[PDB]
Design an enzyme around this catalytic site. Structure first.
Site, PDB file in Angstrom:
ATOM      1  N   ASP A  58      -8.312   0.913  -7.619  1.00  0.00           N
ATOM      2  CA  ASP A  58      -7.552   0.332  -8.492  1.00  0.00           C
ATOM      3  C   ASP A  58      -8.453   0.199  -9.908  1.00  0.00           C
ATOM      4  OD1 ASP A  58      -6.131  -1.112 -10.280  1.00  0.00           O
ATOM      5  OD2 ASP A  58      -6.050  -3.047  -9.295  1.00  0.00           O
ATOM      6  N   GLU A  90      -3.600 -10.552  -3.086  1.00  0.00           N
ATOM      7  CA  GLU A  90      -4.658 -10.053  -4.076  1.00  0.00           C
ATOM      8  C   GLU A  90      -5.066 -11.120  -4.823  1.00  0.00           C
ATOM      9  OE1 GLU A  90      -4.368  -6.271  -5.856  1.00  0.00           O
ATOM     10  OE2 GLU A  90      -5.911  -6.554  -7.114  1.00  0.00           O
ATOM     11  N   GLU A 130     -10.213  -7.135  -4.410  1.00  0.00           N
ATOM     12  CA  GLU A 130     -10.638  -6.216  -5.430  1.00  0.00           C
ATOM     13  C   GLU A 130     -12.055  -6.423  -6.034  1.00  0.00           C
ATOM     14  OE1 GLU A 130      -7.909  -5.098  -8.520  1.00  0.00           O
ATOM     15  OE2 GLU A 130      -9.682  -5.314 -10.126  1.00  0.00           O
ATOM     16  N   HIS A 161       3.484   0.419  -8.137  1.00  0.00           N
ATOM     17  CA  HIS A 161       4.294  -1.013  -8.310  1.00  0.00           C
ATOM     18  C   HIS A 161       5.913  -0.419  -8.593  1.00  0.00           C
ATOM     19  CE1 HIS A 161       0.682  -2.263 -10.055  1.00  0.00           C
ATOM     20  NE2 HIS A 161       0.695  -3.397  -9.666  1.00  0.00           N
ATOM     21  N   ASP A 203     -11.305  -8.372 -17.089  1.00  0.00           N
ATOM     22  CA  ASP A 203     -11.307  -7.336 -15.857  1.00  0.00           C
ATOM     23  C   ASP A 203     -11.401  -5.899 -16.313  1.00  0.00           C
ATOM     24  OD1 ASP A 203     -10.203  -6.463 -13.229  1.00  0.00           O
ATOM     25  OD2 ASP A 203      -8.106  -6.514 -13.958  1.00  0.00           O
ATOM     26  N   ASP A 208     -12.010  -2.907 -14.497  1.00  0.00           N
ATOM     27  CA  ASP A 208     -11.438  -1.783 -13.765  1.00  0.00           C
ATOM     28  C   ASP A 208     -12.149  -0.460 -13.578  1.00  0.00           C
ATOM     29  OD1 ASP A 208      -9.703  -3.716 -12.670  1.00  0.00           O
ATOM     30  OD2 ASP A 208      -7.962  -2.747 -13.517  1.00  0.00           O
ATOM     31  N   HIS A 229     -12.579  -8.252  -9.094  1.00  0.00           N
ATOM     32  CA  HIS A 229     -11.598  -9.552  -9.437  1.00  0.00           C
ATOM     33  C   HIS A 229     -12.894 -10.760  -8.766  1.00  0.00           C
ATOM     34  CE1 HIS A 229      -7.726  -7.938  -9.657  1.00  0.00           C
ATOM     35  NE2 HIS A 229      -8.378  -7.528 -10.723  1.00  0.00           N
ATOM     36  N   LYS A 253      -7.350 -13.119  -8.004  1.00  0.00           N
ATOM     37  CA  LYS A 253      -8.012 -12.701  -9.192  1.00  0.00           C
ATOM     38  C   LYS A 253      -8.314 -14.039  -9.839  1.00  0.00           C
ATOM     39  CE  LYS A 253      -7.850 -10.029 -13.373  1.00  0.00           C
ATOM     40  NZ  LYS A 253      -7.046  -9.284 -14.368  1.00  0.00           N
ATOM     41  N   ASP A 271      -9.151  -3.043  -2.877  1.00  0.00           N
ATOM     42  CA  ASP A 271      -9.148  -2.231  -3.985  1.00  0.00           C
ATOM     43  C   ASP A 271     -10.412  -2.046  -4.319  1.00  0.00           C
ATOM     44  OD1 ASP A 271      -6.301  -2.485  -4.268  1.00  0.00           O
ATOM     45  OD2 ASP A 271      -6.462  -3.930  -6.269  1.00  0.00           O
ATOM     46  N   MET A 308       0.785   2.066   0.729  1.00  0.00           N
ATOM     47  CA  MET A 308       0.999   0.723  -0.094  1.00  0.00           C
ATOM     48  C   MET A 308       2.122   0.657  -1.180  1.00  0.00           C
ATOM     49  SD  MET A 308      -0.264  -1.256  -2.629  1.00  0.00           S
ATOM     50  CE  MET A 308      -1.831  -0.897  -3.512  1.00  0.00           C
ATOM     51  N   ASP A 312       6.247   1.401 -11.750  1.00  0.00           N
ATOM     52  CA  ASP A 312       5.726   2.588 -12.075  1.00  0.00           C
ATOM     53  C   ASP A 312       6.205   3.844 -11.579  1.00  0.00           C
ATOM     54  OD1 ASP A 312       3.283   0.849 -12.347  1.00  0.00           O
ATOM     55  OD2 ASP A 312       2.549   1.078 -10.645  1.00  0.00           O
TER      56      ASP A 312
HETATM   57 MN   LIG Z   1      -6.146  -4.777  -8.177  1.00  0.00          MN
HETATM   58 MN   LIG Z   2      -8.628  -5.462 -11.909  1.00  0.00          MN
END
Ligand SMILES: [Mn+2]
Ligand SMILES: [Mn+2]
Ligand SMILES: [Ca+2]
Ligand SMILES: [Ca+2]
Ligand SMILES: [Ca+2]
Ligand SMILES: [Ca+2]
Ligand SMILES: [Mn+2]
Ligand SMILES: [Mn+2]
Ligand SMILES: [Mn+2]
Ligand SMILES: [Mn+2]
Ligand SMILES: [Mn+2]
Ligand SMILES: [Mn+2]
Lengths: 386, 386, 386, 386
Positions: free
Chosen positions: D286, D180, D216, D53, D254, D256, D219, D182, D244, D87, D56
């Site tokens: 991710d 993306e 993802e 991002h 979520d 992850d 998600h 979610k 992802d 990406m 980041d």
């Molecule tokens: Mn993601």
């Molecule tokens: Mn996630």
């Protein structure tokens, strides 16, 4: 209309209206609140009292002089408003030391620390007049199977609660404990994930009478369970020592919406049950004003918690008092559900041909339960559409 | 490879391989099976035994001569194969008379009938050698809030189980009861919806030692719960009297997939726990071959249940016996989780400065738990990728 | 009060009030209903019309003379009552031939049969005046990963719907199709599991204008989704051709409760959206009176569907018309949400310092959204507590 | 064994291994990582590249000189290692200004800012060589029904994506967008909640060819959906631009988890599909190393992502190449699923008596699908138990 007063026993955690709005994907959207200001603002809305985690009232790491001063100021606010403190709890979840748990951390030194932290705050809770000490073991659990032997963790959890019971009894305190279940979040799975698991665990403590549950609406709903049913089982067991009221939409992260939001019909049936059972404890809200809100919205959302309780209390009472509903309850045999199956005794049952050889199964099966008519009366009462 | 034999104690309900494939949106896809044929075919696959609901073995409504004949034929099959019958149960859910419940039906006459039906089959279960009598109260519950007062229903449920305990004790039978939780389906919400709720309820029975749980993999997973964790709590309580093994994909209708299907890693951790705890009961499968299958597929799916158990047993054993994993378990402090928090006692804890004033919270917080390395060893063992 | 009339456009499937109560754990609790009697009873409650699967109206396997007679009798009932038939559909799920699907069965001969079955009933639907032909592919999907290549199945599904569009266009019929999503049940996972997946699929059909969605409240809620939001996306796409109204409690088996039951607040927001958007299609109920009910309860539950719609319509209208709510909507910037972001164009946006270099992010972040006050106005309106 | 190299195209977000461990109930458990160090450490594990991002890589609020320096250092790390940046994305969720959304914020000035923020980072993404620009609208949605008119929000979302497409085309950039989905978290419900909803939305953009999805694993599983099925539908649509990879246990927050954790069998079927379809994009993770871990555990968890992909790739390939499985696929008619239903055309189908009047439905219904044998071959291959 539906104006709360302190006699309604509505309480709020400091961390509710004081939630700054951080979330895992988001920074704070509100400044920190001084506990003195939340006491004052809650009182003005008609609240009865407030509750706290240790670290909500006294910043983690405070010196003894700082601690005294925080407590002094809080006590002055309570005295200025007439607000009470019926419950307190420990924060065994925010600090990174508790990343694998407090009472069930794999590291023994952390488990001992967690106990000392809790015991320090029990003393303060008692100072402030609390009758109930809640424990939410949010870090107790795992993300992976090898990380946590659940038998060993339950042994540690029992030791911890038994030590706390030894402590309160050694001090002559009247305070009782209430274990708060949650199924997941922040851990992948949390130990004692539902009301049932907590109730079962309590029966294996050395002094079970000292412990009950603090069920939270949204937590049982994170497992897709019926919150009123779970409350009924806690009441049946004599263990509803405290409750957390809020809203949730089903199976997802812990939303902590204001009470009445989320599952509205479950909120109605909950109020109906608390009131018909004569639950006498605090009506405590563990909620978070959404982070979209400013401070005006915080107070609106807190006011809405109480308002919705009072609306639902009126509608549930009207439902139960309606002769038409009383009729419908008899038509659905709720009266028969409340009578003993076999007060005549086992032998008598065994010798009763009407219970087997001469029971007309088809005739009994043909009898409708009339539940839909009853439920639409309930809906009409909730909606004010009678 | 992974060939089951009767010494593995694998058991199956008659209703599993005998499921004709009806569902609420679908007619049967398979003919009915004679219990004699399923006993024979299961034996040939290496099963140890079978279980039954009353109405699986004896058609509902049978005359005494018909009943004797059904039982005679079944006993001959058992004798021809060496198969055992370690568990039986009652069907208190199919017949329309049970549409509001058996033991907690609102209609008292139905509750009495449900008890008589159960007691008749307890006698038969004992005849056939069963050690455990399961009760799944699938119709106990509600679709609407007014239909069922859960406090009153729990009173009725306790009466019923206490009468059954009086009965077995009056007859000198050794059989014990196992209550099977499920959270929903067919009722909108079922009473005693999880392992925890059932464990809690048992503690309030008059003779609690006579009752345990029969947890089913898929049922706890219908509430999104961790099945191995719930099993650990049942083992901790001394209450794992029986188990139902199958697969489920999360929160949806009860799928009853073959064991190993659904949540594979949970199946691995389950086997690891049963084997490390020395669970000595039947490894019973409560599953349904999908209705897409013909009879060849029924037997393939049953064989797969056992195969997957045996594969997972091998991999879990290899995980626990690997010195590298033993090392990783110490690095993650699983050894410390198993030691008492404060065997020195409460006073000693209170006087231990290392537990509070001189506990270095930051140093403890900095210590990684090493759980991901441990879990990837577990994954490598499961997959045969070491 | 809240008395429906035919002008309200309420419709019911024959299979709703006619559901006999079989479930996978239970036999029928009600006798079969003659379609003539359900037409008459629905009309008397104020319904506008009925809908049917082929096999609800004409028993599977009927001869041509039997088929004519069933249709004759049904037409007489429609003529006797003034009831309409705005929608029909095919049963591609009950018969065991469809155990792996209709249009996406692995067996090609079954896919061809499914199409012929559908086309025969399209002709009848048109005979009876239907404007919409629904397709719920309840058997399209899988319990295991190897059983169904989803790319290949989507190719087959597209062929099937394109053939149906060729057929209707060849015949000059005005009827349009509505695909009904569901995420699971009876298959472990169903293809096109949500409104979004169905909308996406339609865009790849050869004549997309002929196809829309028939979303069902409970189906989207079986995936934990927001049904009003999904309806909004279908309306945004121009694809809400029909709707199924009922109730559901979250993520579990398909409950098909009466409309208003289940998630009450979602029912309120749904009605608010349908009415504000001017949806002009049938308000169709796809529900099942619980199997606890007798026939009196069937009709009570059907009446409740309509009553709850009409109550919620009144409350939503009152919410939107309240000047206080209009004020609150402006305070929450719902007016600004409806204005274009950059009607000035891309270049203008790029050259607008107020959009970046001189945007005061903190000032904007400090502005509360006032959503809680708005939502409590909504709650007060729903409950009749203003 | 199972050693990744850059040719495997494994990529990681900076925010994955760099996650400090804050959660809503917990403070950070790890120090911040310099992007240079994560590039170096990922390269050493065999990664191909990293993603970011904006915020980041460049702290929010940086001056132009600070921005240049951050980018310079990052570029040097990329050059030192041979790592790529395939990406990038925008952070439209952390800063409190985005509390009601970026592109669909009610406040128009926030929507304009969100677009400017995104466009600045598109330019940087292109600088760094990215082929895909992801958009996760985590703040787009609502906690209450009145707060967000979803039709109006979708209008705003379409404007935003159409402006971004105008921008890239104006600049002659090759980069494409990937939306993306979610379903919820951090908002109570998120707009475009699944792959299907995003695919449907894209078809209404002015230049649909510029947009695809970035699904993802976790998600779609937060809605209880089948992730491989959703991927298949995205591939069918030509829209799998990026993915992802991670793990999730069902319907909850979520998680992850590292890839392979969570639903292991779904991970197997996912890899099988990506590889059989020849997906050529990054295999991007991710994920978040659990906050229990130190930095050593971060790298172990990242390594495990890649390892598990490579194990599953081997097992899926072996499954598909096994003659026994090829046989079983024919026995289950997967070959027939891949052939057109009616390449003979509509008229021919209509005139084919074998499709209706002379179709032997019972014979077809009796044919077992042989799916359980196929699935147990799949299980045996996954487990290395052939
Ligand atoms: Mn993601
Ligand atoms: Mn996630
Ligand atoms: Ca609500
Ligand atoms: Ca599996
Ligand atoms: Ca409701
Ligand atoms: Ca896994
Ligand atoms: Mn909560
Ligand atoms: Mn709480
Ligand atoms: Mn089951
Ligand atoms: Mn079972
Ligand atoms: Mn449905
Ligand atoms: Mn429907």
């Amino acid at each position: 209309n539906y104006q709360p007063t302190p006699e309604d026993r509505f309480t709020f955690g400091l961390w509710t209206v004081g939630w700054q709005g951080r979330d895992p994907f988001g920074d704070a959207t509100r400044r920190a609140l001084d506990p003195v200001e939340s006491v004052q603002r809650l009182a003005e809305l008609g609240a009865h009292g407030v509750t706290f985690h240790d670290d909500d009232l006294i910043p983690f790491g405070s010196s003894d002089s700082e601690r005294e001063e925080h407590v002094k100021r809080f006590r002055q606010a309570l005295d200025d408003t007439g607000m009470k403190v019926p419950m307190a709890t420990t924060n065994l979840f925010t600090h990174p030391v508790f990343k694998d748990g407090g009472f069930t951390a794999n590291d023994r030194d952390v488990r001992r620390y967690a106990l000392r932290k809790t015991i320090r705050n029990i003393d303060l809770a008692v100072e402030l007049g609390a009758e109930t000490y809640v424990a939410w073991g949010g870090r107790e659990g795992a993300e992976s199977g090898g990380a946590k032997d659940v038998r060993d963790a339950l042994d540690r959890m029992k030791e911890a609660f038994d030590l706390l019971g030894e402590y309160v009894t050694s001090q002559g305190y009247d305070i009782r404990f209430a274990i708060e279940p949650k199924p997941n979040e922040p851990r992948g799975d949390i130990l004692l994930p539902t009301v049932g698991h907590a109730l079962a665990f309590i029966e294996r403590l050395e002094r079970p009478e000292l412990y009950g549950v603090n069920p939270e609406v949204g937590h049982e709903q994170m497992a897709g369970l019926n919150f009123p049913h779970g409350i009924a089982q806690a009441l049946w067991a004599g263990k509803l020592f405290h409750i957390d009221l809020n809203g949730q939409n089903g199976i997802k992260y812990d939303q902590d919406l204001r009470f009445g939001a989320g599952d509205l019909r479950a909120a109605f049936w909950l109020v109906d049950l608390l009131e018909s059972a004569g639950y006498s404890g605090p009506r405590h809200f563990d909620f978070k004003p959404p982070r979209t809100e400013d401070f005006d919205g915080v107070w609106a959302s807190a006011a809405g918690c109480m308002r919705n309780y009072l609306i639902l209390k009126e509608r549930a009472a009207a439902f139960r008092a309606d002769p038409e509903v009383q009729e419908a309850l008899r038509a659905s045999r709720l009266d028969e559900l409340a009578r003993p199956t076999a007060a005549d005794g086992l032998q008598a049952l065994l010798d009763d041909r009407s219970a087997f050889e001469e029971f007309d199964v088809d005739a009994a099966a043909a009898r409708g339960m009339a539940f839909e008519r009853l439920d639409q009366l309930a809906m009409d009462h909730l909606l004010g559409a009678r």
